[PDB]
C-alpha cells in the first residue's frame, strides 16, 4: 500500500501556483514567497473592503467640502445644517453632486442655509 | 445490499488520523506542548509515581497472610429456586443441569434472600447458611449437606 497520490499533490501545487500568478519576477518561478503574496494581498484587501470605504468617503466629504468651501462653507456647519435640515440626511450621493450641480449643490446648500436659519 | 452496501450508526466512525494536517493538527503537538518529559517519544513514564517520593501504596503496611486452604461453594440465590419447581433433590445436578453456574466451587449455598416458592425437602447441599435454613427448613425443607 506504498502509494503516492503524486499528481494530486502537484495539483495542489499547480492549483495554488496558477492561483498565485502575476506578481514580481522570481515569485512564480519559485513556490513559497508567492504563497503569502496572494495571501497578504487579501489580508489588506480585506482591510480595504473597509478602507476604500473609509477613503472613498474621504473623497466624498473632501470634495464636498471642496465645493462647499467654493461656496465658502465648512463641512461641519454644513452637515450640522444637514441634521438641522429635512428628511434628507443623505450623505454621499450628496457627495456625488460634484458634477455640474449648482442647482442641487448650491440649492441644497440653501436648504442648509434655511436649516441653520 | 451488495449493490449499495451501507453502514448503520455507532458501529462505524472515522478512526482519528492523528498526526497529520492543520485542522486537528496533533503532529506538531499530539496534544502535548513541547519541551518536557511529557513531550517526547516512547510514552515513557511509570504510572505510580509520587515524584520520587514513595507512593500511596508504597506507604502501606503489610496486612494479613492468606490461607492456602481457602475454599468456598459458588453461592447461589434462592431466586433460582423461584425459577425451578421443585426440582426434587436440589443438588449440583439440579444446579448445573439447571446450568446456573457450571464451573463451581465444589458445594452449593443459597441465601435466605430469595423466596420460598419451592416445596421439596431433600435439598442436597455441601453447606447452606443457617439463615437460609430458617427459610427452607422452616418452609418444607430437609438438610442434606456435606
Amino acid at each position: 500500500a506504498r502509494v503516492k497520490g503524486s499528481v494530486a499533490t502537484r495539483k495542489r501545487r499547480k492549483r495554488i501556483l496558477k492561483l498565485a500568478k502575476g506578481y514580481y519576477g522570481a515569485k512564480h518561478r519559485l513556490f513559497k514567497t508567492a504563497k503569502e503574496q496572494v495571501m497578504n494581498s487579501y489580508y489588506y484587501a480585506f482591510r480595504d473592503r473597509r478602507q476604500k470605504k473609509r477613503d472613498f468617503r474621504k473623497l466624498w466629504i473632501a470634495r464636498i467640502n471642496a465645493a462647499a468651501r467654493m461656496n465658502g462653507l465648512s463641512y461641519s456647519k454644513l452637515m450640522h445644517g444637514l441634521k438641522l435640515a429635512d428628511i434628507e440626511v443623505n450623505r454621499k450621493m450628496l457627495a456625488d453632486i460634484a458634477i455640474a450641480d449648482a442647482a442641487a449643490f448650491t440649492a441644497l446648500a440653501e436648504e442648509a442655509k434655511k436649516a441653520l436659519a | 445490499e451488495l449493490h449499495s452496501l451501507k453502514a448503520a450508526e455507532g458501529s462505524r466512525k472515522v478512526r482519528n488520523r492523528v498526526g497529520r494536517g492543520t485542522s486537528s493538527g496533533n503532529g506538531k503537538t499530539s496534544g502535548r506542548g513541547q519541551k518536557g518529559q511529557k513531550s517526547r517519544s516512547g510514552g515513557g513514564v511509570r504510572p505510580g509515581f509520587e515524584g520520587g517520593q514513595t507512593e500511596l501504596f508504597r506507604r502501606m503496611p503489610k496486612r494479613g497472610f492468606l490461607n492456602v486452604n481457602r475454599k468456598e461453594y459458588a453461592i447461589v440465590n434462592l431466586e433460582t429456586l423461584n425459577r425451578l419447581e421443585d426440582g426434587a433433590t436440589v443438588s449440583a445436578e439440579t444446579l448445573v443441569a439447571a446450568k446456573i453456574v457450571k464451573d463451581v466451587k465444589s458445594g452449593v449455598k443459597v441465601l435466605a434472600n430469595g423466596e420460598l416458592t419451592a416445596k421439596n425437602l431433600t435439598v442436597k447441599v455441601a453447606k447452606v447458611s443457617a439463615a437460609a435454613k430458617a427459610a427452607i427448613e422452616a418452609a418444607g425443607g430437609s438438610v442434606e449437606e456435606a
Binding site: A1 | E1, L2, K6, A8, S11
Partner: protein, 206 residues
C-alpha cells in the same frame, strides 16, 4: 408460502414449504453488513510483508563524525531517510479473521434468507440430476427461466456432480449447498435456484 415448487423452472407452478416459521421478520441489515465485513477478509490471505532497517541492511555503523564536518546529527544511510529506506510502522504479516456468535450468524442467514423469501428470486427446483455433465443441459435448464445477471445454485447435501464438475465455464453459475452459507454466498448473486430438500437443507440448524 407460495413461490415455486418447480420441478423445472416453468414446469410446476406451486407452493413453497418454506416453512413459514420465524423467517418472516425485520431483516437486520446492521447485522448483515457486520457479516459482510467479518465474512469479508475470511479469504484475505494478508501475506503482504513488512520490513525494517534492522531487518534488511548493510550498515550498523555511523558513516562519519559530525563535528565541524558539514552536516547534522545523523544516523546513517541505513537510517530510513536515504534511498536505503526503512519502513516506519507500515504493514505486517497480520491475519484478519473473526466469526460471529451462533445466534447472530443464524440470524444473519435468516435476514437475507427472508429478503429472498419475499423477493422470491429463489426458486424451488427439483433434482434434475442429469446423465452427462454437459452444460447445454444446465444451459437450457438454467436458461429455462434464464435469470440473467448471476445465480446461486442450491444442490442437495448429497453432492450433485454434473453441473458441479462443470458449469464453472457457465459464467453466472454458483455451485453451493447447505455447507456454503455466508452472506458473500447469497448477497453476491441475489438470484438463485433451489433443490427442494431445503427443509432439511435449511431448517436443520436455522
Amino acid at each position: 408460502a407460495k413461490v415455486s415448487l418447480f420441478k423445472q423452472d416453468g414446469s410446476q407452478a406451486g407452493e413453497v414449504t418454506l416453512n413459514d416459521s420465524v423467517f418472516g421478520i425485520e431483516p437486520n441489515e446492521s447485522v448483515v453488513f457486520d457479516v459482510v465485513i467479518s465474512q469479508r477478509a475470511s479469504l484475505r490471505q494478508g501475506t503482504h510483508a513488512h520490513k525494517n532497517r534492522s531487518a534488511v541492511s548493510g550498515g550498523g555503523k555511523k558513516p562519519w563524525r559530525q563535528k565541524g564536518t558539514g552536516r547534522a546529527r545523523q544516523g546513517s544511510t541505513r537510517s530510513p531517510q536515504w534511498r536505503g529506506g526503512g519502513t516506519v510502522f507500515g504493514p505486517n504479516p497480520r491475519s484478519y479473521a473473526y466469526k460471529l456468535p451462533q445466534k447472530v450468524r443464524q440470524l444473519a442467514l435468516k435476514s437475507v434468507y427472508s429478503t429472498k423469501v419475499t423477493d422470491g428470486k429463489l426458486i424451488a427446483v427439483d433434482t434434475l440430476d442429469f446423465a452427462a455433465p454437459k452444460t447445454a443441459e444446465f444451459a437450457k435448464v438454467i436458461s429455462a427461466l434464464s435469470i440473467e445477471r448471476k445465480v446461486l445454485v442450491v444442490l442437495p447435501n448429497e453432492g450433485n456432480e454434473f453441473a458441479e464438475l462443470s458449469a464453472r465455464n457457465l459464467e453466472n453459475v454458483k455451485v453451493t449447498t447447505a455447507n456454503s452459507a455466508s452472506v458473500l454466498d447469497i448477497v453476491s448473486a441475489d438470484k438463485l435456484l433451489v433443490v427442494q430438500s431445503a427443509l432439511t437443507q435449511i431448517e436443520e440448524v436455522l
